[PDB]
Structures are given as structure tokens and as C-alpha cells.
Amino acid sequence: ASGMVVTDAGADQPIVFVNRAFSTITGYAPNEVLGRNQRFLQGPQTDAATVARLREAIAAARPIQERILNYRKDGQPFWNQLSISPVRDETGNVVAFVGVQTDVTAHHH
């Protein structure tokens, strides 16, 4: 099951919703992450160029997909196949962002 998050469109994109699979993948309960920017999933081995691409895409409200190294609440690394899309109304205003997270790590084999 893939994680899904909704964030606000404005002012550093606080989380406003996560699905159950997001908790399964990340180790965080919904109420521990509401109101926060998703960058808390990053850590020292996260690729800075990837993060830069995300930063520029979100600022421009452009869809973006990346495979990014993230970290569970407990510190356990996982590779995140991440897809972010703006949600627009019919006059083009960005209402929110949606993010999908798939854990693509081979954890056990």
C-alpha cells in the first residue's frame, strides 16, 4: 500500500492529511506529523540535489517524481519512490499538494 499525504499549498506546505499506509511506511502517527513540512523524513544520507529538485518544483507548483532516501521515526532508512502533484481549481489556483510515497527498499532480501 502506498502512503498518501495532502499539504497546504502556501507557507512551507504543512501536512493536513495522511493515510494509514503513510504511518505504516514512516512509523509516524498522523497527529505527530500534522502541521509539519515533510522534510522531517530526510536525513544525512539524503541526496541534496534531489532535495533541491523537490524544492524548485514545489515553489513553481510543478509535478515531480523522485526516488529519495528517507528515514522512519525510529531512524531506519528507506527508499521512497515519491510523486508530488499540485491540486488546482479550474481557474488554475493551487488549492493543495498531494504526495504519494512507496517504500521501494529491499529490506529483507
Give the residue numbers of the binding site for FMN. 37, 39, 42, 55, 70, 80, 101
Check binding of 70 to ligand FMN (CB under 6 A).
Answer: yes
Nearest CA to 49 out of 60, 61, 57 is that of 57
| 54 vs 109, beta carbon nearer ligand FMN | 54
| 15 vs 92, beta carbon nearer ligand FMN | 15
What are the two backbone dihedrals, phi and then psi, of residue 104, each rounded to the nearest 5 degrees?
-110, 15
State the alpha helices, DSSP H only, in 1-109: 20-26, 30-33, 48-59
Task: Restricting to residues 25-64, name those near a second copy by CB under 8 A.
Answer: none
